[PDB]
Structures are given as structure tokens and as C-alpha cells.
Write a protein that binds this ligand. Structure first.
Ligand code: ZN
Lengths: 209, 99, 199, 49, 78
């Protein structure tokens, strides 16, 4: 039963793997072209294997520049996750010495756990999700254009072109979905490429607070 | 005894009703799904629905789910939609500034 | 009974005319009272009073709506070409073929004075001129008119005549019209928005 | 003053202040709302404000 | 090198015509030949037609930098 749930696991795997690819971490094409049938071959079944760690990934090193920087992905099985589970995953991180970990939860988190997610370890970052939001990769959506993360040298180049200061740019709040998606630390610039009615693309720059 | 019958058992709690819309033009004589209810994230999270094309008339939800850069586009679509569905002509550059 | 029902429908509307001004006035106010400060600067950005950016280019390309001849679009290419033929129907010149047209238009637009224009627009006029090249091809094909100019029925050249002098004239005219439709710096774009939306 | 019974001239409401802004007329708005209606001259101490 | 547009905006016409008309109304010297004209502003626009007006505008940029332009040098169209 719960064939939909198995497809949900397939889809969340697909999308997180794709997201890690776009973010620049270690992802390979043979992984990205996996099918639902092959995943069924790889995985077990919803009533047989359950929600705990079966096919989650931590291979996501910073393949772009320095593999020492690495992503965890965790799949806690309980619906609501509390502070003790935070401690368990915290010691998991600390003993593994992995810098980053994406967290997905089933039915939300306890207020104490929600509180800890802002100050647990300034040396670590623990972006949080629910499977709800990862059933679709928002970049595939029509209503949202393409983004690019922009680099300090080009920051200087642009604000030289117009003779501005960075407080004179438009804004994008950190909590915004794509901001969460690329996990951008505040104080950076993102290039927005607005499609137009013609070949002329509309380029525009937006600063994250 | 009179309360439990009210309890929800299946479907989205926030939806009220949904209607299948049909078309006839020569390009295609097909169907499309139109729904009322103030929660976009739920309708997108099901099998069968081509979620990457789903569109909401109210600004706040699309901002909450797709980010402000999608809100900026929903304004302009909405204003142009209502102006023309009356039939008054306003140059688009005059509404782009407002968004 | 017919008179009573008809006067009921008359009164329904006549109540409206005053009332439908009740909300209109306060859109006209609330809008302009938040948006009358925005203005267009000499560097083609749109900035508030404190000097912050709203838009890097007004409208994306810097064209005001009071100079749009077309449907939101600065020119209607067909109209201009027909006009320019009518005022200069040079009888001395020979008519161009597909090859001469492309070579001539390349000869002119390669000059730097046109390169200063917005490239989008430059490519746009290219696309149109290619369009006219195809049609002159079809006409000469269907009638098999020889390009040498020697076929006895000279009238066969009147069918799709353009001459070089007309081509240069046409290009200079499109350059004007586009160059004189930019939102002049200092314009109160903010308040013009409000009047166009409240109206 | 206000009205023809007392020769009050005519009012240039807020709604024409807006139409005069849109044209980008900066000297005529100043002229039509200060130097003709109610210009006045005042002494200000620069030290205390 | 100067970057701003070479076309005279309409606001510039209005302000140069106003200021020069006020200068003509005082006993400032006048250099176009007058065909018996009396109104200060008809004279102002005649001096504009002949490109004699002695003014220089100073186009400010929002960073504080600027660009002088002779009134007798901009591109002028009715
Ligand atoms: Zn004092």
C-alpha cells in the first residue's frame, strides 16, 4: 500500500540530488538520469524498509572547489522531531566533522528544536525542510526566472558601472524560497534574468538581506 | 455523536470545490482543472498534476511559495488581465513601474 | 407596468454615476500620494528621493508611452515603407533584386552611426528586411522576370519595385523615429503612472 | 477669501497640484501656490533654530 | 568624455526660455535683430532659433558629477 508514499520518496531523492547538482556539489549524470524503476531496484519498500536512513546521501562534497566541505542529508523517521533528536544528529555531525547538513521532517518540529536551529553551532549550518516543499523543484516553475549567484569581483564591477553603494540596490529576504534553495548567506548579490516578450533578456540585480 | 460526522476523512482541508473546465477550439478540445481554496502548496503536492504550471490569482500565496520574484509577475498578469477583460487600453510600461 | 419596470432599470444606473466616483477618488489619491516622487535620471535609472534604485532602465528599454505609434511598439514597419515609396517614386533608378538588397542594406548599416543604436532594434529591422526580400523573390519567380531589365513588358518591374534611394531614406527614418522616443531625463514617470491608472 | 459673495477667488485643489506635477512644471507650481496666494517673510535665528 | 544624450530635453527648453526671457525683461543686452517685436518671450524664442542664447546648462548626475553643455550646441527640434 501507500504507493504514493514510495513515489514521494523517489521524487524527494530526485529533487534533492538535482538541487545539490545545481548548487555545485558532487553530483554525476548517471545519478541524475535514474528512473523510478531503478530506484525501486535500489531501495526496498515503504512497509518493508520504512522512513529511517536507507538511501539518503552524504557524498555531497564541495566537488566544485574543495571536497573537504560536504553535505549531510538526514531522514528522521519520527513525525515530530524534538530537541533530543537534534542532539543525536548534532553529535553525528560533530563526530563526522561534516560542515553542512540538509534536514527534512515529516510533520514539523518542536518549539525547542525550532529554537535550536538558529544557534546550535555557528560553525555548522542546518537548513530545514519538509518533504512537502521538495515534491517539486521551484526552478522548473513557470512563474520564476533564472538566478545566478554573483561573485565579489563582479560585485565591484557592477557597482563601479553605476557608481552606487550596495545599500542602494533592491532587496531579497533570506527566508524567500529560492534564497533558501541556494542557501545564500546574507550580504551577497544575485543576478536575475527576467524573460521578455522578445530575444532581449531583462537583467537585474538584487541584494540579499 | 453529532460531532464526528463532521470530521474530514479525505482530501485537502482548505479546498472548497473544484471544477473541470472544457474547451473546444481547433487547436485542442481538452480539459483543465480549476480550483478555489487558499493554499497552493497542497494542490501542487500530488500525483497527476503538472505542478510546474500551477497558478494562483491571489498574490500572497504565490509569494509565500514561489518567492517575491514570482509575486512581481503575478501583479502584472493580474492587472493586465482585469483591464483587458474589461476592455480598456493601458500601456504595459505604465503598470510595470507599479509592480 | 412596462413603464414602471423600465424606470426601475433607469434609476438603477442613475444611482451609479455618483457612487462609482466614491472609490475612484481615493485610488486617485492613495496612488499618487505614494508614487509621485519617482523620477527618471540622466543615467537612465529610476530613483526615489533618497537616490535608491527602483529600475535600472525605465520600462526595460527607456521608451515613453506617449510616443508609441504601434501597439505598445515604437514603429509600424509596413506603414513607413509604403509612405516612403509614395513620396519618392524615383523613375530613373533601377529596381533591386534579392542579392542587391541584402548587399545594400549591409553596406549602410555597417556604418558606426547605426551601431550606436540599441542592438535589439538593429536586429529587428534586419528581420523585417529579410522578410521583404523573400516576397520579391516569389514575385520574380512566379513571373520568371529576368533581372537584366530587357523583357519587353517593362511594366513587369512595377510589381515589387524598390530602388536604392528609397532604401537609404527608409533606414534614416527608422533611426530618427526610434531616437526621438526615449523618456527624456527629468520626466515625472511616477505621477504619470498614477494618472494613467486612476483614469 | 472663500466665495463670490465676498470675492474669494477660485481654489486650485490638491487634484490640480497633481496635474501640475505630472507636466514637470516646477516654477509654475511655486508661482501658483506661493508667490500669488500667501507668500510671507519671517526671521529665523540660526543659532537656536 | 560627455555621456548624456545630445538631444535637448523639453524641460531644458522651458527653463532656458524662462530665464532668458526674464533677463531680457531687465535691461540685459540683446543680440538677435528684432523685427519690431515687443514681447520678451517672443524675443527669447527668436534668440533660440538663431542659436545666440548665452547660457550654459550643467547636467547633474546622481553621484554628484556633472557635464556642461552649451545651449548653442544641443540638438533642437520643435
Ligand atoms: Zn536664537
Amino acid at each position: 500500500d501507500d504507493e504514493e508514499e514510495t513515489y514521494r520518496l523517489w521524487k524527494i531523492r530526485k529533487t534533492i540530488m538535482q538541487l545539490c547538482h545545481d548548487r555545485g556539489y558532487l553530483v554525476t549524470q548517471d545519478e541524475l538520469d535514474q528512473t523510478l524503476e531503478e530506484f525501486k531496484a535500489q531501495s526496498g519498500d515503504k512497509p518493508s524498509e520504512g522512513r529511517p536512513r536507507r538511501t539518503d546521501l552524504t557524498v555531497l562534497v564541495a566537488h566544485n572547489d574543495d571536497p573537504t566541505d560536504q553535505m549531510f542529508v538526514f531522514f528522521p523517521e519520527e513525525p515530530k522531531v524534538g530537541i533530543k533528536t537534534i542532539k543525536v544528529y548534532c553529535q553525528r555531525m560533530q563526530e563526522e566533522n561534516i560542515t553542512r547538513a540538509l534536514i527534512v521532517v515529516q510533520q514539523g518540529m518542536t518549539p525547542s528544536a525550532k529554537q535550536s536551529l538558529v544557534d546550535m553551532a555557528p560553525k555548522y549550518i542546518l537548513e530545514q525542510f519538509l518533504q512537502q516543499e521538495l515534491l517539486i523543484n521551484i526552478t522548473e516553475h513557470e512563474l520564476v526566472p533564472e538566478h545566478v549567484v554573483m561573485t565579489k569581483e563582479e560585485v565591484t564591477e557592477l557597482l563601479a558601472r553605476y557608481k552606487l553603494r550596495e545599500n542602494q540596490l533592491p532587496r531579497i529576504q533570506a527566508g524567500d524560497p529560492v534564497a533558501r534553495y541556494f542557501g545564500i548567506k546574507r550580504g551577497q548579490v544575485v543576478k536575475i534574468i527576467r524573460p521578455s516578450e522578445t530575444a532581449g533578456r531583462y537583467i537585474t540585480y538584487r541584494l540579499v538581506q | 455523536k453529532e460531532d464526528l460526522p463532521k470530521v474530514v476523512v479525505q482530501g485537502i482541508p482548505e479546498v472548497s470545490r473544484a471544477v473541470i473546465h472544457i474547451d473546444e477550439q481547433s487547436g485542442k478540445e481538452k480539459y483543465k482543472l480549476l480550483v478555489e481554496g487558499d493554499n497552493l502548496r497542497a494542490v501542487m503536492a500530488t500525483h497527476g498534476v503538472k505542478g510546474t504550471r500551477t497558478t494562483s490569482n491571489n498574490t500572497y500565496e504565490v509569494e509565500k511559495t514561489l518567492g517575491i520574484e514570482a509575486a512581481r509577475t503575478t501583479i502584472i498578469n493580474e492587472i493586465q488581465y482585469t483591464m483587458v477583460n474589461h476592455g480598456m487600453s493601458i500601456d504595459r510600461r505604465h503598470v510595470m513601474l507599479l509592480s | 407596468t412596462e413603464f414602471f419596470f423600465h424606470t426601475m432599470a433607469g434609476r438603477e444606473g442613475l444611482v451609479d454615476t455618483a457612487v462609482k466616483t466614491a472609490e475612484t477618488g481615493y485610488m486617485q489619491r492613495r496612488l499618487v500620494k505614494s508614487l509621485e516622487d519617482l523620477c527618471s535620471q540622466y543615467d537612465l535609472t529610476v530613483r526615489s528621493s533618497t537616490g535608491d534604485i527602483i529600475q535600472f532602465i525605465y520600462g526595460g528599454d527607456g521608451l515613453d508611452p506617449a510616443a508609441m505609434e504601434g501597439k505598445d511598439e515604437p514603429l509600424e514597419f509596413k506603414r513607413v515603407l509604403d509612405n516612403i515609396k509614395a513620396v519618392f517614386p524615383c523613375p530613373s533608378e533601377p529596381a533591386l533584386s534579392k542579392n542587391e538588397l541584402i548587399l545594400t542594406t549591409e553596406s549602410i548599416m555597417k556604418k558606426s552611426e547605426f551601431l550606436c543604436c540599441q542592438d535589439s532594434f538593429l536586429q529587428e529591422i534586419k528581420k523585417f528586411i529579410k522578410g521583404v526580400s523573400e516576397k520579391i523573390k516569389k514575385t520574380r519567380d512566379k513571373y520568371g522576370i529576368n533581372d537584366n531589365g530587357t523583357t519587353e513588358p517593362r511594366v513587369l518591374y512595377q510589381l515589387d519595385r524598390i530602388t536604392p534611394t528609397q532604401v537609404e531614406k527608409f533606414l534614416e527614418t527608422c533611426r530618427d523615429k526610434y531616437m526621438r522616443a526615449q523618456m527624456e531625463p527629468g520626466s515625472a514617470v511616477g505621477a504619470l503612472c498614477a494618472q494613467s491608472i486612476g483614469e | 477669501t472663500e466665495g463670490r459673495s465676498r470675492d474669494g477667488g477660485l481654489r486650485l485643489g490638491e487634484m490640480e497640484r497633481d496635474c501640475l506635477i505630472g507636466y514637470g512644471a516646477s516654477m509654475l507650481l511655486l508661482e501658483r501656490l506661493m508667490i500669488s496666494s500667501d507668500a510671507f517673510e519671517v526671521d529665523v535665528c540660526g543659532q537656536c533654530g | 568624455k560627455r555621456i548624456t544624450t545630445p538631444y535637448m530635453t523639453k524641460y531644458e527648453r522651458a527653463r532656458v526660455l524662462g530665464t532668458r526671457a526674464l533677463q531680457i525683461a531687465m535691461c540685459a543686452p540683446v543680440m538677435v535683430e528684432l523685427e519690431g517685436e515687443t514681447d520678451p518671450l517672443l524675443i527669447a524664442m527668436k534668440e533660440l532659433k538663431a542659436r545666440k542664447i548665452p547660457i550654459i546648462i550643467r547636467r547633474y548626475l546622481p553621484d554628484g558629477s556633472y557635464e556642461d553643455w552649451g545651449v548653442d550646441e544641443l540638438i533642437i527640434t520643435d
